[PDB]
């Protein structure tokens, strides 16, 4: 009835962490799906289907759609009869993950449209310029940030990851059971590898994301 992850359509971007949430559950549960990567400036492909420019969204066999990544994950888990453990990781780690946001806006986000692995998300110059024009509101100037990565944000990310690392386990983030902590935290580690040349990704986090990469079709940057 289903195949190993290596029929229903899932519309997404490669770089989007909310889409990573869906691919994580889909690949680990061997959910049979067809990955549809939408160009960043292809507004009509989003709006014609779900009426808004957002990803991810899943198309069922009956032609109806599910948006919201959390709801797509629960649907896939139901279809596959695949258990997802509840969140158990310490609130300290959740707070540290939240503190990464102002820094990865400056360190990682400007690299999104230009990274060679994101060419599927940005197959044209207009898709790249679309993203830059659309995201420069709350990010800033992409050229200035790319030429001068703020080292205070580099230090802040390194320090936060150092504080998080003792709590990170294998095979999954809370050891044996795949959980909602994997769903909510791994996408943050995933996008961090876009700037691995600038950042210090510690041992436990490195082993954890390498295991997720091995068990899925998600490739780290
Ligand atoms: Cl979106």
From TrEMBL:
Pfam families: Glutaredoxin2_C, GST_N_3. It comes from Francisella tularensis subsp. tularensis (strain SCHU S4 / Schu 4). Gene3D superfamilies: 1.20.1050.10, Glutaredoxin. InterPro entries: Glutaredoxin2_C (IPR007494), Glutathione-S-Trfase_C_sf (IPR036282), Glutathione_S-Trfase_N (IPR004045), Thioredoxin-like_sf (IPR036249). NCBIfam families: PRK10387.1. This is Glutaredoxin 2. The gene is grxB. Residues 8-84 form the GST N-terminal domain.
